[PDB]
Design an enzyme around this catalytic site. Structure first.
Site, short mmCIF file in Angstrom:
data_model
loop_
_atom_site.label_atom_id
_atom_site.label_comp_id
_atom_site.label_asym_id
_atom_site.label_seq_id
_atom_site.Cartn_x
_atom_site.Cartn_y
_atom_site.Cartn_z
N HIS A 299 0.82 -1.21 0.00
CA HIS A 299 0.00 0.00 0.00
C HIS A 299 0.85 1.26 0.00
CE1 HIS A 299 -3.21 2.73 1.62
NE2 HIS A 299 -2.13 3.30 2.13
N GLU A 300 1.77 1.37 0.96
CA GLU A 300 2.60 2.56 1.01
C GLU A 300 3.32 2.80 -0.31
OE1 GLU A 300 2.44 4.87 3.05
OE2 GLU A 300 0.90 3.75 4.18
N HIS A 303 1.51 4.66 -2.96
CA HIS A 303 1.55 6.11 -2.97
C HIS A 303 2.71 6.61 -3.83
CE1 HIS A 303 -1.66 6.53 -0.12
NE2 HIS A 303 -0.98 6.14 0.94
N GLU A 379 -6.14 6.84 -0.78
CA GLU A 379 -6.07 5.64 0.05
C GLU A 379 -6.73 4.45 -0.63
OE1 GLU A 379 -4.63 5.08 3.61
OE2 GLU A 379 -3.48 6.11 2.09
C1 LIG Z 1 -3.16 13.16 0.60
C2 LIG Z 1 -2.45 11.85 0.20
C3 LIG Z 1 -1.44 11.37 1.24
C4 LIG Z 1 -0.44 10.32 0.71
C5 LIG Z 1 0.92 10.84 0.23
C6 LIG Z 1 1.66 11.76 1.21
C7 LIG Z 1 2.67 12.63 0.44
C8 LIG Z 1 3.25 13.79 1.25
O1 LIG Z 1 2.82 15.04 0.73
C9 LIG Z 1 3.03 16.17 1.56
C10 LIG Z 1 3.99 17.11 0.82
O2 LIG Z 1 4.11 18.38 1.44
C11 LIG Z 1 5.43 18.77 1.82
C12 LIG Z 1 6.00 19.83 0.88
O3 LIG Z 1 7.27 19.40 0.41
C13 LIG Z 1 8.04 20.48 -0.11
C14 LIG Z 1 8.91 20.04 -1.28
O4 LIG Z 1 9.29 21.16 -2.06
C15 LIG Z 1 9.17 21.04 -3.46
C16 LIG Z 1 10.53 20.86 -4.10
O5 LIG Z 1 10.44 21.01 -5.50
ZN LIG Z 2 -1.95 5.30 2.50
#
Ligand SMILES: CCCCCCCCOCCOCCOCCOCCO
Ligand SMILES: [Zn+2]
Ligand SMILES: CCCCCCCCCCCCCCCCCC(=O)OC[C@H](COP(=O)([O-])OCC[N+](C)(C)C)OC(=O)CCCCCCCCCCCCCCCCC
Ligand SMILES: CCCCCCCCCCOCCOCCOCCOCCOCCO
Ligand SMILES: CCCCCCCCOCCOCCOCCOCCO
Ligand SMILES: CCCCCCCCOCCOCCOCCOCCO
Ligand SMILES: CCCCCCCCOCCOCCOCCOCCO
Ligand SMILES: CCCCCCCCOCCOCCOCCOCCO
Ligand SMILES: CCCCCCCCOCCOCCOCCOCCO
Ligand SMILES: CCCCCCCCOCCOCCOCCOCCO
Ligand SMILES: CCCCCCCCOCCOCCOCCOCCO
Ligand SMILES: CCCCCCCCOCCOCCOCCOCCO
Ligand SMILES: CCCCCCCCOCCOCCOCCOCCO
Ligand SMILES: CCCCCCCCOCCOCCOCCOCCO
Ligand SMILES: CCCCCCCCOCCOCCOCCOCCO
Length: 444
Positions: A299-300, A303, A379
């Site tokens: 699952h992970e 993503h 999810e």
């Molecule tokens: C809503 C779905 C959850 C599943 C995946 C989680 C992924 C994490 O996303 C959060 C990202 O936010 C953090 C921002 O990161 C900054 C990176 O800067 C961009 C560089 O080009």
């Molecule tokens: Zn998940």
């Protein structure tokens, strides 16, 4: 109202929107609390999913959390209302100036005063949160069997998190405020670019340089699980490097590039796994067997393969761009400042505070809700990717066992769960993992 002065319309609308959201969320919370009070035996849609002893333990856990949540949310709405009505934010500002001038810094040193305000504001919030966090950790979590830490660990941890936050926050804040002051009329592009770069740096260094200050990480030991993870990662072209176990059990028995696994997720590596007749049943221990850990990893990794993480990053930076643009539009409007007790001055930081937290309030709420719906969609897609890897049966099993170890209550009000749940209810996830598979399916 129409004829009310703009500064009064602005203040009033922020405060009334706050109260409106609070009443909507109190309403929803009551509908969910009612379910905990009402649903007192296992439904038949759930005989195979929880036994009656775990069901009562979860109902009682969730009901204590719900009661604590009511009081926390009432205190928080009152404190915020009173700060706004009696000018706590201008007060703290003037208090920060007072510290500045007894150190020899006059009002012309606005960023300096802003950094003092940032320190005091975060301290105030840290201090007012502390009674609540202690009660949740040492009463609620202790009572229901989850807390593993002492008070001394808790306070050591809290101070370290506060210090490290300031070490990063203040220097970054002095620069961002400088950039804002020195760009213009396109300052907001450079403000946006700087926050993107800071965000990128922070995320890139966090694993090696920040996370180990707060938790113990150790390599996963050699064995059957380490090798099946490697096989699976290859199978999807995932460039797996190292598998680590974080000793979450130093804090809690709860369970939730590199792969990091909580030790409480692992039946055979949990540190917490390491009488009138039976006695035998008191062998029912925490974590998932290896084939279940693998389906959860499946699952992970969904993503990653499906690009959800990249979509979230793009959404957050587009949103950041949009807010800096609108901040640029709005920050010359002196009525926005006067609404909140800033008559003689318009400090840049106060501007950010008012526009991002108060003025953008309705947009922030709509977007949170939109991200929650999207999250639920991702999810289901990640579950489906594990199905596609051939692991539906093990993921089904895994979700039931984690729901039990964490005392999740698997009935929810449909409105509360629509508004709040970033993961779809357990039963909806189990039903989805039961469906069919694949042919052409070219019936577009
Ligand atoms: C809503 C779905 C959850 C599943 C995946 C989680 C992924 C994490 O996303 C959060 C990202 O936010 C953090 C921002 O990161 C900054 C990176 O800067 C961009 C560089 O080009
Ligand atoms: Zn998940
Ligand atoms: C139904 C609408 C409602 O107000 O529910 C009250 C709900 C409870 O509704 P209730 O009708 O289920 O009655 C509850 C009675 N006991 C607790 C004995 C089971 O009360 C609250 O949660 C206070 C929330 C205020 C937000 C709703 C504002 C109402 C409109 C003004
Ligand atoms: C505690 C008091 C701190 C006062 C500082 C106000 C800071 C306000 O936010 C500044 C924004 O800077 C970072 C930009 O990030 C992009 C924002 O996108 C989300 C906006 O919503 C903010 C509310 O959650
Ligand atoms: C020009 O003024 C526009 C400001 O709009 C403020 C509306 O506030 C809504 C807060 O909920
Ligand atoms: C200003 C400081 C506020 C302190 C926080 C108190 C939070 C109130 O929530 C209490 C409700 O839920 C608590 C349940 O836990 C106690 C269980 O007691 C044993 C019953 O068998
Ligand atoms: C004027 C509104 C301010 C609300 C803040 C008060 C928060 C502190 O209250 C603690 C509640 O403790 C209640 C104990 O409840 C009995 C046990 O649970 C039922
Ligand atoms: C005049 C319009 C009021 C209509 C909505 C009522 C808002 C009540 O929410 C208050 C909840 O928060 C507790 C602290 O605030 C208490 C004051 O609320 C009084 C509202 O006039
Ligand atoms: O302190 C946090 C409590 O916040 C309650 C009121 O704060 C005003 C923010 O208004 C925007 C909420 O939608
Ligand atoms: C003197 O001015 C004091 C303004 O009020 C300060 C307290 O406001 C926050 C209350 O909570
Ligand atoms: C009493 O003093 C009140 C100080 O409260 C200020 C809260 O500032 C937090 C910024 O949102
Ligand atoms: C379970 C892990 C708990 O660790 C306790 C300390 O964590 C650092 C922050 O302190 C708790 C949050 O306090 C609320 C704001 O003061
Ligand atoms: C109110 O705060 C409640 C604190 O609960 C206990 C905190 O200290 C317990 C350590 O044994
Ligand atoms: O002052 C030194 C630390 O005091 C704050 C204690 O609690 C901090 C909780 O964590 C807050 C992180 O922003
Ligand atoms: C006053 C409104 O300011 C508008 C900000 O929008 C971006 C400005 O860039 C072009 C200004 O010449």
């Amino acid at each position: 109202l129409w004829e009310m002065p703009a500064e009064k319309r602005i203040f009033g609308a922020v405060l009334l929107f706050s109260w409106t959201v609070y009443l909507w969320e109190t309403f929803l919370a009551q509908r969910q609390r009612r379910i905990y009070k009402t649903t007192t035996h296992v439904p038949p849609e759930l005989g195979q999913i929880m036994d009656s002893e775990t069901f009562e333990k979860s109902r009682l856990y969730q009901l204590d959390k719900s009661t604590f949540s009511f009081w926390s949310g009432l205190y928080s709405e009152t404190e915020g209302t009173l700060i706004l009505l009696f000018g706590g934010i201008p007060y703290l500002w003037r208090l920060s100036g007072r510290f500045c001038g007894y150190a020899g810094f006059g009002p012309e040193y606005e960023i300096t005063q802003s950094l003092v305000f940032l320190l005091l504001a975060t301290l105030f919030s840290a201090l007012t949160g502390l009674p609540w966090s202690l009660y949740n950790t040492f009463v609620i979590e202790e009572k229901h069997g989850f807390n593993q830490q002492t008070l001394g660990f808790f306070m050591k941890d809290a101070i370290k998190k506060f210090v490290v936050t300031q070490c990063i926050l203040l220097p970054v804040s002095s620069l961002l405020l400088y950039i804002i002051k020195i760009g213009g009329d396109y300052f907001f592009i450079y403000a946006w670019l700087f926050t993107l770069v800071v965000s990128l740096v922070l995320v890139t260094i966090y694993a090696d340089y920040i996370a180990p200050l707060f938790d113990k990480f150790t390599p996963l030991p050699e064995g059957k699980l380490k090798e099946e993870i490697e096989v699976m990662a290859k199978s999807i072209d995932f460039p797996l490097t190292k598998v680590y176990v974080v000793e979450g059990s130093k804090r809690s028995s709860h369970s939730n590039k590199r792969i990091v696994l909580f030790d409480t997720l692992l039946e055979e590596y949990s540190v917490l796994n390491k009488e009138e007749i039976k006695a035998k049943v008191k062998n029912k221990k925490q974590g998932c067997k290896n084939e279940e850990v693998l389906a959860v990893l499946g699952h992970e990794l969904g993503h990653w393969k499906l690009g959800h993480t990249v979509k979230n990053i793009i959404i957050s930076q587009m949103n950041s761009f949009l807010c800096f643009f609108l901040f640029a539009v709005l920050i010359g409007r002196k009525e926005l400042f006067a609404a909140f007790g800033f008559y003689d001055s318009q400090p840049t930081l106060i501007g950010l505070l008012i526009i991002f937290q108060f003025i953008f309030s309705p947009y922030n709420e709509v977007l949170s809700f939109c991200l929650t719906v999207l999250s639920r969609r991702f999810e289901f897609q990640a579950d489906a990717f594990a199905k596609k890897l051939g692991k539906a049966k093990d993921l089904y099993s895994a979700l039931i066992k984690l729901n039990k170890d964490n005392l999740g209550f698997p009935v929810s009000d449909w409105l509360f769960s629509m508004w709040h749940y970033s993961h779809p209810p357990l039963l909806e996830r189990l039903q989805a993992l039961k469906t069919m598979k694949q042919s052409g399916l070219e019936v577009l």
